[PDB]
A paper describes a structure:
The same stepwise evolution approach was followed to identify hotspot D-amino acid sequences that bind to streptavidin. Two 5-mer hotspots, “wqeea” and “lanvd”, were selected for the extension step with all 160,000 possible combinations of D-amino acid dimers. All D-peptides fold into a left-handed α-helix with one turn for GyGlanvdessG and two turns each for the Gdlwqheatwkkq and GGwhdeatwkpG peptides.
Numbering used by the authors:
A (entry chain B), B (entry chain D), D (entry chain C): 15 to 134
C (entry chain A): 14 to 135
Amino acid sequence: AGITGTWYNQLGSTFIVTAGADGALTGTYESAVGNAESRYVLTGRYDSAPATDGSGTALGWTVAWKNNYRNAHSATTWSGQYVGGAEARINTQWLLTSGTTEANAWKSTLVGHDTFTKVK
Amino acid sequence: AGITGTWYNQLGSTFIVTAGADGALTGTYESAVGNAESRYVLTGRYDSAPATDGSGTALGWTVAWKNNYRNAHSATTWSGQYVGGAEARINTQWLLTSGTTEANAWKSTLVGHDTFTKVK
Amino acid sequence: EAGITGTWYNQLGSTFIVTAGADGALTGTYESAVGNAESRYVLTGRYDSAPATDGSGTALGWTVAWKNNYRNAHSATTWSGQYVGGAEARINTQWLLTSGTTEANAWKSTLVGHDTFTKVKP
Amino acid sequence: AGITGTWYNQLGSTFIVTAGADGALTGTYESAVGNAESRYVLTGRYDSAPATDGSGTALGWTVAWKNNYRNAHSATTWSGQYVGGAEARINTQWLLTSGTTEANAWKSTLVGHDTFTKVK
């Protein structure tokens, strides 16, 4: 499957994941600094039987930005695909929703993209 | 938390979820038809200690579209917030990524918005 | 024919007046429900001027940069969607608002949402 | 403004744009992907008086995918910012909506991200 392990995004945020045999993703997400106060639980799912035609392996995961140290009252989901080989990558787009009042709900959600690599 | 229960989106797709003490979301997602072939595992995260200022509760979850009957080689993440009160609602935006070759990756990801309530 | 020219409202009452040109152009203004001049901005976009005849909607999109003579938010929004005809005509959209940021803050430059418009003032 | 010119995205699509003094963007777009041939008209807007604090210049534009050669019954909008630097760049995210039936509207909209430089 090639997904289990440590991954690094374009700015060095660190995605630590186990791809279980049942299609589960479990792990932690943290900043490039690597300090414990920046580390959060993640969970998600992946395609455990992907195509063997050069297509990527679809996956997604969520972090709610609450840990024992802080709480941003927000959650990010990453949706994307793992691409194997000598240029291995996880290519994602993400949605970060903050808890808001209804009056501020129109501006609750940020969107962006993250590309993860196996080396920093 | 108010999140545990059976929810329906605007097209009747059915989200059966449990919100655990630790911030975990677990459950299943299926079509309005309610047939076993359309039912899939989900996992996610939510803010287990939301603000007390009238803001919503941030959350997200993932389904990989593989079960014992079908594999679409794709995964969806929903990112949103739970809004409590008279009529509880979960307002989300979602990203559905299909596994693609690199040449087709431009058309890998659909986006939309789902609103869930506890009534069909 | 196209059904798009005129005034559209979301449920919060933000309002746009648009002309759908025979050339595929969209031109008009976007404003708040209050309708004061400080809230009104130039809108420009494009639509499919020869849509399918199979019951499909009409694809369209437009941009507003949030600068006018009275304010500048240093940002722009694009709405991408489709027009759906009938007595309760609707424009169903999703949108992206990008704010000018430094590179360090670029990860948080872009909001996403959805807007549905109808011809009936709320 | 720095915006006026010929730009290319990461896939080699060609974005030929003029930034008018009135905040207008006009020009043509030639797509390296999809149901597309030759140039398509674009129009959009940009911030003609950007902040002077090091921030980029917000802008957006639309292409409806109809020209004299073909009609994909769809439209893309790009929302982003121009980043003046050593190597000027326009970083965008985009939404491509197809005209669909109501039953297919859930899968009407693709999302992605394009980065443009004046060097191909």
